Each structure stands twice: as structure tokens, then as C-alpha cells.
């Protein structure tokens, strides 16, 4: 399982290895002799185009809406208590209307879905237009998440919990830098791996590696300090 | 003390040498799909006996060079004096 696999890819390493690259265009090119239906259907590669700002914004909005609906399903609705009269009226609606459960679900999940969509879209636009080209990635993520979650906690939940929102945003930013923008459990390269370029003979490479080993010996404390017994 | 002590290493730019010559080879492998497409287009154009003058092995090459340079140029520019070092 990997998070944000496409962004954290070593294009040079995959190219030298021949491994397929996630940066390939992934586009359809219908032929000029193809049918009109085929030409119309080949337009779906737009839905895959990733440089599409509006597509990405709607993608983030859908993710946020799904998260909000899941939260409502799990914790929010069950924690919130509905008035007895309201419950009786909606049950009567279910009795008097076919598929009344669907409409009740729509009514109950509209607030969570809408707020999740808004949060997702705003968060995507925020992160992409701002903080995308900062120098310190960790600091940028921490500050952006802190501010965004501070505002979100102030608005959605309560203006009196904005400090806790900011702290949670800092924590979430650290977590995101750790496991979303970085590959700690998603390694696709062996540690110490490298690639060779230029016309160097194997003898020269072995000589250089011997010199590197001689330098590496100095890392050991005993040899550096000359504190070894005569074996 | 930062910037007050000696520098450990000198780059090609610090020594006054051009690194793009090698950096092109370095960045070649990642732009393999476009290189393969350009090769296939060149092969087809060579095979063609009566080729329309409009046909040319140019646009695939344009895409390939664009992809190569998108990676080659920023690496060199970030190492130049006068710009905030990455």
C-alpha cells in the first residue's frame, strides 16, 4: 500500500531499469478513419488528464464528500439526537412513500456531504495554488495544514476550538510529510543502489571501490583512534 | 560561520564547466516512451516511399526534447549564481 505513489517516483531510476513509468501520457488517439462513435468515446482520456485544474478540484471535492458521508454514517448521525416528533414524522413519510429511506438518507447526509465537498475543494485549491513551490516542504505542509484546520475547526465545529484545530493541523501536516510526501514504508529502491555512467573499466571501478572501502574504514571508532589489540 | 569556511566540493559550474552535456544523458532514460515513439515514427517515415511533404519526424521529437529539457534545465539553473540556492 502506497500513498501518493505517482508524485514520489524516481523517473531516472525507473527509466534505467525499464520499469513502466507512471508519468506516461496515458492518452487515447482515435484514428481519423475511426467511427464517429469511437471518436466520441475516445474523449474519456480527458477524465484521466491530470493537468486539469477543474477535474482535480472536483476529484478533491468528491473525496471530501465521501469522507463526510462516511463520518456521518459512522459517528456523526449516531451521536446526534433527533427530536422524537421529527423521527415520527420521517417514519410516517417512509410508511406513506416508496423508497422513503433513500430520501431520508439524502436529507441526513446532505449537510455532511456538502461540507466535505467544500472542504476538499478549498483544501485542494489552497495546497495547489499556494505552498506548491515552497522551499521547506515540511514547514510548508505544517503551516498550511495548521492554518486550514484552524479555520475549519473555527467554522464547522466551534470558534472556541480553533487552537485545538491548529494543533491537530500541525500533527496532520507532520503525518502527511512523513507518509504522504515521503516514502518510508513505500520504498521502490534498494538502499545504497546507484547507476553507472561513462566508459570506466571494471578494473578502474574496483580500484575506486577499494579506495572507498579504505575511506569507510575510518568510520569505525577503534581504527580511527588506534585502540585495537594486536591480533 | 556559515559561508565563512572553505567549501568541500566544487561543481562543474563552480569550476566554470558546462554540465548540460552529461545531464542530457542523465535525463535521457526517464523520457523513454517519447524516444521510442520518435524512433518508430522515423522508422515508418523511412519505410514510406511516397511520403506527403507535411509528414515529418518533428513533433514527436519536439515532445521528446520538451520532456528532456523540463528536467535538464531546472537542475542546472538551480546551481547558478544569482539565484536562491535550492
Amino acid at each position: 500500500m502506497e500513498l501518493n505513489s505517482s508524485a514520489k517516483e524516481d523517473s531516472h531510476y525507473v527509466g534505467v531499469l525499464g520499469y513502466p513509468s507512471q508519468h506516461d501520457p496515458h492518452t487515447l488517439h482515435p484514428k481519423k478513419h475511426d467511427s464517429t462513435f469511437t471518436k466520441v468515446y475516445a474523449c474519456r482520456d480527458m477524465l484521466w488528464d491530470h493537468h486539469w485544474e477543474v477535474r482535480n478540484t472536483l476529484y478533491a471535492g468528491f473525496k471530501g464528500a465521501l469522507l463526510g458521508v462516511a463520518y456521518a454514517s459512522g459517528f456523526g448521525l449516531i451521536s446526534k439526537t433527533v427530536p422524537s416528533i421529527v423521527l415520527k414524522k420521517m417514519f410516517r413519510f417512509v410508511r406513506n412513500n416508496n423508497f422513503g429511506h433513500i430520501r431520508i438518507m439524502q436529507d441526513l447526509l446532505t449537510p455532511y456531504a456538502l461540507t466535505g465537498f467544500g472542504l476538499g475543494s478549498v483544501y485542494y485549491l489552497y495546497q495547489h495554488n499556494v505552498w506548491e513551490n515552497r522551499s521547506n516542504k515540511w514547514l510548508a505542509e505544517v503551516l498550511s495544514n495548521a492554518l486550514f484546520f484552524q479555520v475549519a475547526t473555527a467554522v464547522c465545529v466551534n470558534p472556541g476550538f480553533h487552537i485545538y484545530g491548529m494543533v491537530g493541523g500541525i500533527l496532520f501536516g507532520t503525518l502527511k510529510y512523513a507518509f504522504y510526501n515521503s516514502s518510508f514504508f513505500q520504498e521502490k529502491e534498494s538502499i545504497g543502489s546507484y547507476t553507472t555512467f561513462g566508459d570506466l573499466s571494471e578494473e578502474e571501478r574496483k580500484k575506486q571501490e577499494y579506495k572507498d572501502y579504505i575511506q569507510f574504514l575510518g568510520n569505525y571508532h577503534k581504527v580511527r583512534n588506534g585502540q585495537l589489540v594486536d591480533l | 560561520m556559515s559561508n565563512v569556511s572553505d567549501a568541500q566540493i566544487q561543481e562543474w559550474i563552480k569550476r566554470g564547466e558546462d554540465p548540460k552535456e552529461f545531464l542530457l544523458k542523465e535525463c535521457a532514460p526517464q523520457c523513454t516512451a517519447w524516444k521510442e515513439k520518435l524512433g518508430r515514427c522515423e522508422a515508418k517515415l523511412k519505410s514510406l516511399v511516397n511520403a506527403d511533404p507535411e509528414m515529418s519526424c518533428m513533433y514527436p521529437l519536439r515532445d521528446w526534447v520538451t520532456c528532456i529539457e523540463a528536467c535538464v534545465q531546472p537542475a542546472i539553473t538551480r546551481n547558478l549564481f544569482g539565484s536562491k540556492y535550492m
Binding site: 492518452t27 488528464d49 486539469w52 | 513533433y59 519536439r62 515532445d63 529539457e69 523540463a70
Partner: peptide
Amino acid sequence: FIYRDDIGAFWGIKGYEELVTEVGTHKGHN
């Protein structure tokens, strides 16, 4: 409304299709 990214026209601005123009601004950030 949607402008293909491999035609050689940036954001739908046709022309300049025999040049390398996306380097440093759209593909790569000098």
C-alpha cells in the same frame, strides 16, 4: 473548454507547434 496537452499548444493557444515552448514554465520550473 478542454485543450489537449500533447497537441503542442499550451492551454489551447494554437500555433507555435514547431517549437519547444513548455520548457521552464509548464514542464519544468526554471
